[PDB]
């Protein structure tokens, strides 16, 4: 639970009653289902999840009456689907995970063009239009060939099933930035604009001297994979 607000009696947008103060700490993370299966077995996952999605669906329509504050009180609901790593979002929004031509889970930009230009990109990706684009893929009313069919639909082949709110995790941005800076340091130890294509052993050695530098000063030890703390 994140926010609970009030619009009554009207003429106003609303008044926040209680905004949660620390949703990050797991001390507020209430579990609702568990499945002894894998993130990839799309069949098994949807087969178990149908209930959850369907009742989330039926929820957003009606209103809810409980006995609260001594009186019978009413409630509406909206749902913000945020907390997923990218891979999951793609595999559940019907995209091509994870490093293919289409990358922005929001903007229809191709990969390469996101290099020359990087700033102005309007958010377009949305659930209803993704269903529309999947239908266009399935029917192919324009009778296009394979790759123009990829393009006109902006590459939405798998039918999404679970709604998503269009946004990114906060942690894994930090994680990817951390690993990218780590590698860029490993590379700038040597010379790559002086030596365009270095070899593998040079990479191992530059990593080693980078770990020596990060250990001698700052007293920092390596790990296999970088969690949040190593990033920070």
């Amino acid at each position: 639970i994140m926010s609970i607000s009030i619009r009554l009696e009207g003429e106003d947008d609303g008044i926040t009653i209680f905004q949660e103060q620390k949703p990050n700490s797991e001390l507020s993370c209430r579990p609702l289902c568990l499945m002894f299966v894998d993130e990839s077995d799309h069949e098994t996952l949807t087969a178990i999840l149908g209930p959850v999605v369907a009742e989330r669906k039926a929820m957003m329509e009606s209103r809810l009456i409980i006995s609260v504050g001594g009186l019978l009180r009413s409630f509406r609901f909206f749902f913000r689907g945020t907390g997923y790593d990218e891979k999951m979002v793609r595999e559940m929004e019907g995209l091509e995970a994870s490093g293919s031509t289409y990358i922005c889970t929001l903007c229809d930009s191709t990969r390469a063009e996101a290099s020359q230009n990087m700033v102005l990109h309007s958010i377009t990706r949305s659930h209803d239009e993704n269903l529309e684009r999947y239908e266009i893929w399935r029917k192919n009313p324009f009778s296009e060939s394979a790759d123009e069919l990829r393009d006109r639909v902006k590459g939405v082949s798998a039918k999404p099933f679970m709604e998503t709110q269009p946004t990114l995790d906060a942690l894994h941005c930090d994680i990817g930035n951390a690993t990218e800076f780590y590698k860029i340091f490993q590379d700038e130890i040597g010379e790559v604009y002086q030596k365009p294509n270095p070899s593998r052993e040079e990479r191992r050695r530059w990593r080693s001297t980078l770990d020596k530098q990060l250990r001698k000063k700052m007293k920092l030890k390596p790990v296999m994979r970088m969690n949040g703390n190593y990033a920070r």
């Binding site: 077995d41 799309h42 069949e43 149908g50 369907a54 399935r138 029917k139 394979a146 082949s157 039918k159």
Partner: protein, 351 residues
Amino acid sequence: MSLQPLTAVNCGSLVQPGFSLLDLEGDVYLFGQKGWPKRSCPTGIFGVRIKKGELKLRAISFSNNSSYLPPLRCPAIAHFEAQDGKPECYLIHGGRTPNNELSSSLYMLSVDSRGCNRKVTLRCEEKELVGDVPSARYGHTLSVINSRGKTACVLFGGRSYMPPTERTTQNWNSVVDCPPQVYLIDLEFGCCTAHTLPELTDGQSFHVALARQDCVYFLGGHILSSDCRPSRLIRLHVELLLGSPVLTCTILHEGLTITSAIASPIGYHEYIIFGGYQSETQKRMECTYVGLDDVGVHMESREPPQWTSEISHSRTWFGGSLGKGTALVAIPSEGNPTPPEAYHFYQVSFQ
């Protein structure tokens, strides 16, 4: 009438318990795959070859004017014979969506161009359903016949989820039999007509049926009403008048208690039933030889190829006919560790 162990060179993670095999003009194409089509092959279908016991799976593609199909799981199949106006057709409908749900779609498939270099192009077209349409379902059976002398298609069987008024989340994955009304469908126009039979007072699933000379013979299968497996063969005789779709049916005294078999067509009509499941735990080990003449069915057994002690201990299995007495089956493979090719593959041959 013998088996041979195979090994998959790679791609041993792209088969799933239910799938389909079609031979249309030579090459065999494999339909259905765990998860949505990867970009390495968006077609979702793989041409299959066997060389030196090793198994090779190659990507395909379609025509520009052909539509792309979702990877159905356990569909219904019809081998629409080479004739007017487009030889040769394969009708598939309507299977199970990988995102677990059903489809009211009909798919007409054919081969279009080749090679130019040992390659094959396919074509897949939807078709509207004028009706009185059949609802979505799975595991059912559909076939094609010529009645004096024009062509028609007969669909029967299959189960589905509870009616949407009764859609209960606690019972979301429950599945009950579709009402026992058969459906007659024409390729053009897509007029679907429902028919009922005062004999077929119960539904059924997974039953392999056969068509010959506008007479259709359904073998017994699994039923969930009385949880039983009536062996009794079911005969029917269908005629397309102008414009009356006249039908008669009858019960045979004895058929066979088989569920979810592999049908290989050996001869003109000389078929073998490879194997499947006789009980909720016992799987039918032996084979079956079936001739079909206009007089009736003609039944016998053959020498069942001795299975490796491995498969004999398997809880389940399945397979498909690579064509002409040849078929492919697979064991859900276990062991330490997960290979992860969870399937051992056996080729099987007649004579």
